[PDB]
Design a protein around this ligand. Structure first.
Ligand SMILES: [Zn+2]
Lengths: 235, 104, 104, 263, 342
């Protein structure tokens, strides 16, 4: 229970953002940030504290936290780059000082890195490299500023592991109209199908974390939305 | 020379930092000094609650509101926080890239 | 305590930001041998923002003083140009003394 | 039963029905597709792979590891007694019509040469390289729902876990043997409807204007030209409607452009 | 449990570079830029994460020690579990997909698999990217050229026998002819590529099955060289690195971590300070860094960062400041009940 005002948050993207099909919702970023702030992974308490910094739609069952929208400037636009993760079995990793390989003829059985359960996993994921990221939300500007600046949270699939979508220079500006849930009838974030908002059908939990809870039918915006930075700063 | 003096100090203190690193540090400290000095300059206006000021920065290097990636982005702190909306909606005397892109 | 009443009851048009600055200054001055660094943009009010904490801390342990160093020569007037009666009235409400000292 | 691998098995890999043998009762989930044994009716095929790992493959999954040289020809002459395997084909795709339960195999000319005559009798094969799959998909009238495998590849487990029914031409899910996570389906999702309408409306533009549009959009999607430059190029070449018909996603833009320059 | 945010700066002692397949192109080796060429590169957090995970795994190996036979107790399965979290033997606790706080037993028993995750267990350590703090802090380092030793120092020829001198002359002749052949083949390839940007589908297909055949001709000509497959007098392509003394803002964190897991992380950082190398091109001493990380935590309930201490890695030593950091380090040194063999 705190006075919530519609704010738009714009940050400078530093690394490619990997979208997990559904555009990353700022509510999820804030949920992760609070899970870091409150040393607890229990969804109930983290959600209860998230409602204190974000406006929650009871009738609609979501937080006022728009999905990711790529702020593109006339200098740099939305770019297609691959978030690229490779196992690097260095000579130090491949040495008897670190483990005991099975031996035959006194020779150490080399690890088959070309394939199998012990291969060099070349996991490549799509990622969108825009100069800025933007979200809208009806919440406390102080708490979200503190979280986004100091909590280890990024935009995309794995900021924790892959460090994808690192951001900085988080700038919050007030808005005039709440553009978190709806935008002239176009959902700007995951919402239930019965809400009457159009967009793209999908399956996902309405409330974060988006990897737990029954995946019920939802309507979500385009995964990759781009807007001019000048238009985003207009408010 | 302030860069040289600081580099010599750190070198004698044992810290291993290149001269250009000390130059960058001194440049950032000078930039913060400049931000404070121009904050003082702006503070010359709005001395009373009823005062109305039109602040006109004629410097090309002052960051445009839409150019959030300008090198001197910290200069936005010159504007008081309360008037940051007025910073966003400002008459630009010579805006760059002043067109309507289609890849929106 | 007297903090809430004595500001508004004395007739001063105190604002919330004034209350926050006054409370922060008072709490910082309560702590001993530390250093308090507060930025107070024009409009919050420094002439009375920190002097009212000084009076409030004067009420306790009333055997100390508070030097108020102001660089600009005009601001030393400003401390006692049109606010000396104001602070005197505040002292009359709080109750004990001002005992000014216009040092030069 | 009602899983992606079952449909492709029934439509396409049922040709090697004679060449597995009877199943074995199992008590653990199929390591290849990963679904529960409750939908296997308690039967499964035990196997040991080239990495010496005990793996259970259900009826529709085990077909990707069957050796049927007398039906599938020889894949490597150095080892005559192991023919082509569905799970080992690289560069070979297929389109499976689930409701009809039919399959069309998109293999390159080399694989078609390696296949015997008896193979074609059960499965219709059209010679197409890896890049010509999109040509077949665009030109031929697809029938939905369908399973479109783009690269059988060698990672059979990831292939089966990437299979997804394409319910309509708006979203055709390519199964390229790479694990179809929710992060990378944009690289494996093909919108034949949007590509088709864009191809229909591209006829109104010159070949020079076409090349210009494709190169500008490709550079923009790869962030090699500034958005202002691309906008100037589109405005000067009157390419605004084409951009309006493109998805905002740059990866989807690249995918549909790759499709366009193939047809 | 506590969330320890290591916010700090990495000052580069010698140029910091990394090879990334997407970033690297035929034009040259470029760092990941998250955009076009005229953008700010970032050192991947994946590379720092893997380096610190390797450091932590080495710390665990040292803590565990060696068997009576002088061989590490870890086998291939356990070694890969601890190094890269790949269960090769298919024997791992398949935690429930929806239960977040799963593996508390495994987390307590294996602090390494707790800090960095395994496949199916979310890691506790989030290693961010090293973002430069300037607009010009990267450059085309390395480069240079491989020079034939006997064409630079004539004295080195006094050691070669006349048979080997003739071998050298044959090598140089083969190199010259291979160069003058491959250059012409590449000129033809360039002309074909120039004709690739005015072609239609049919002639495109005709003139790109030709380029790869020219490449095969290049490979065959290189194979024809009897004395050396590759030219020795090679100009080395430069690699893009961060300049020496680049202040890169680095954001790391550990989430809801027991004091023992944080102690393992600090020990891994201390061990990393022995060879504080990030990235490749170690031949040119690339990767040497000195970093100062203010270790902060979150106040219970309040969204305020408390400063628990500082971690300053420098060539002169590791400076751990803050009592709680020492407490975590000793706690990790204690609790010998860790089980890295299961
Ligand atoms: Zn199966």
């Amino acid at each position: 229970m705190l006075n919530f005002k519609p704010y738009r948050v714009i940050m400078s993207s530093l690394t490619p953002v990997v979208i997990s099909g559904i555009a990353p919702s700022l509510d999820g970023i804030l949920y992760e940030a609070l899970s870091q702030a409150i040393p607890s992974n229990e969804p109930g308490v983290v959600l209860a504290r998230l409602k204190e910094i974000l406006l929650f739609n009871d009738e609609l069952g979501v937080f006022h936290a728009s999905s990711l929208r790529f702020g593109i400037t006339p200098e740099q636009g939305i770019g297609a780059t691959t978030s690229m993760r490779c196992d690097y079995l260095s000579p130090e990793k491949l040495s008897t000082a670190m483990f005991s390989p099975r031996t035959r003829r006194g020779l150490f059985t080399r690890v088959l890195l070309t394939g199998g359960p012990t291969k060099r996993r070349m996991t490549t994921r799509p990622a969108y490299s825009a100069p800025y990221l933007t979200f809208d939300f009806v919440g406390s500007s102080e708490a979200v500023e503190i979280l986004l600046n100091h909590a280890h949270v990024g935009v995309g699939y794995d900021y924790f592991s892959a460090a994808n979508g690192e951001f900085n220079n988080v700038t919050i500006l007030p808005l005039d109209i709440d553009t978190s849930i709806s935008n002239e009838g176009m959902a700007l974030r995951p919402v239930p199908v019965n809400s009457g908002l159009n967009g793209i059908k999908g399956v996902s939990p309405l409330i974060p974390p988006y990897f737990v809870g029954e995946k019920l039918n939802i309507v979500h915006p385009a995964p990759v939305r781009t807007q001019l930075i000048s238009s985003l700063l207009r408010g | 020379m302030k860069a040289e003096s600081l580099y010599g100090y750190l070198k004698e203190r044992g810290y291993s930092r290149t001269f250009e690193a000390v130059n960058r540090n001194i440049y950032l400290e000078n930039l913060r000094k400049v931000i404070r000095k121009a904050k003082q300059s702006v503070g010359r206006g709005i001395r009373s609650e009823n005062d109305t000021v039109r602040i006109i920065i004629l410097d090309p290097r002052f960051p445009e509101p839409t150019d959030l990636s300008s090198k001197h982005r910290s200069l936005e702190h010159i504007i008081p926080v309360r008037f940051r909306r007025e910073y966003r909606s400002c008459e630009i005397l010579s805006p760059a890239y002043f067109e309507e892109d289609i890849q929106c | 305590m007297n903090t809430s009443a004595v500001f508004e009851s004395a007739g001063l048009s105190l604002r919330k930001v004034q209350q926050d600055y006054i409370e922060a200054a008072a709490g910082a001055l309560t702590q001993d041998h530390k250093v308090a660094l507060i930025s107070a943009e024009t409009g919050v009010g420094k002439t009375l923002g920190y002097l009212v904490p000084a009076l409030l801390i004067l009420l306790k342990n009333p055997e100390a003083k508070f030097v108020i160093a102001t660089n600009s020569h005009a601001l030393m007037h400003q401390i006692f140009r049109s606010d000396r009666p104001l602070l005197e009235q505040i002292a009359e409400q709080c109750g004990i003394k001002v005992t000014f000292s216009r040092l030069m | 039963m009602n899983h992606p691998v079952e449909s492709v098995y029934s439509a396409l890999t049922s040709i090697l029905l004679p060449y597995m043998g009877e199943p074995v009762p199992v008590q653990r989930n199929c390591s290849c597709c990963g679904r529960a044994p409750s939908e296997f009716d308690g039967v499964g095929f035990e196997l040991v792979n080239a990495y010496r790992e005990r793996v259970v493959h259900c009826r529709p999954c085990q077909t990707f590891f069957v050796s049927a040289p007398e039906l599938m020809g020889v894949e490597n002459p150095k080892k005559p007694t192991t023919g082509q395997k569905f799970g080992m084909w690289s560069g070979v795709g297929a389109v499976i019509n689930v409701e009809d339960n039919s399959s069309v195999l998109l293999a390159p000319q080399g694989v078609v040469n390696k296949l015997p005559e008896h193979f074609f009798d059960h499965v219709e094969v059209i010679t197409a390289t890896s890049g010509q799959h999109l040509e077949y998909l665009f030109n031929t009238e697809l029938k939905f729902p369908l399973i479109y495998i783009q690269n059988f590849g060698v990672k059979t487990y990831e292939l089966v876990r990437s299979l997804r029914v394409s319910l309509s031409a708006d979203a055709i899910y390519t199964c390229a043997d790479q694990l179809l996570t929710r992060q990378n389906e944009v690289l494996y999702m093909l919108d034949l409807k949007k590509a088709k309408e864009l191809h229909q409306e591209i006829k109104n533009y010159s070949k020079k204007e076409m090349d210009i549009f494709i190169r500008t959009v490709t550079l923009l999607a790869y962030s090699r030209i500034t958005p202002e430059a691309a906008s100037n190029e589109f405005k000067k070449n009157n390419l605004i409607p084409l951009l309006l018909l493109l998805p905002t996603d740059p990866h989807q833009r690249l995918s549909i452009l790759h499709l366009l320059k193939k047809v | 449990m506590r969330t320890l945010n290591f916010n700090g700066k990495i000052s580069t002692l010698e140029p910091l570079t990394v090879t990334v397949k997407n970033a690297v192109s035929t034009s040259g080796h470029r760092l990941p830029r998250n955009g076009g060429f005229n953008a700010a590169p970032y050192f991947p957090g994946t590379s720092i994460r893997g380096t610190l995970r390797h450091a932590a795994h080495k710390v665990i190996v040292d803590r565990v020690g060696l068997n009576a036979d002088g061989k590490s107790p870890f086998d291939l399965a356990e070694h890969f579990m601890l190094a890269q979290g790949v269960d090769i033997n298919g024997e791992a606790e398949t935690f429930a997909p929806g239960e977040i706080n799963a593996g508390a037993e495994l987390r307590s028993k294996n602090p390494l698999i707790s800090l960095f995750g395994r496949w199916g267990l979310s890691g506790k350590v989030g290693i961010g990217n090293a973002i430069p703090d300037g607009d010009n802090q990267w450059g085309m380092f390395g480069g240079g050229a491989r020079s034939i030793m006997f064409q630079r120092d004539e004295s080195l020829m006094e050691f070669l026998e006349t048979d080997q001198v003739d071998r050298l002359e044959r090598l140089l002749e083969e190199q010259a002819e291979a160069s003058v052949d491959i250059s012409q083949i590449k000129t033809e390839q360039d002309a074909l590529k120039k004709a690739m940007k005015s072609a239609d589908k049919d002639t495109k297909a005709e003139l790109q099955i030709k380029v790869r055949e020219l490449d095969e001709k290049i490979q065959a000509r290189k194979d024809q060289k009897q004395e050396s497959r590759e030219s020795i007098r090679r100009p080395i392509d430069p690699y893009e690195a961060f300049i020496t003394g680049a202040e890169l803002s680095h954001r790391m964190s550990i989430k809801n971590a027991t004091d023992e897991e944080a102690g393992l992380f600090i020990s891994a950082l201390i061990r990393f300070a022995a060879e504080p190398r990030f990235g490749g091109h170690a031949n040119h001493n690339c990767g040497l860094v000195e970093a100062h990380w203010t270790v902060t935590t979150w106040k219970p309930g309040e969204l305020v960062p408390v400063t628990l201490g500082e971690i300053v890695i420098t060539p002169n030593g590791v400076e751990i400041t803050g009592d709680e950091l020492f407490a975590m380090v000793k706690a990790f040194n204690e609790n010998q009940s860790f089980d890295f063999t299961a």
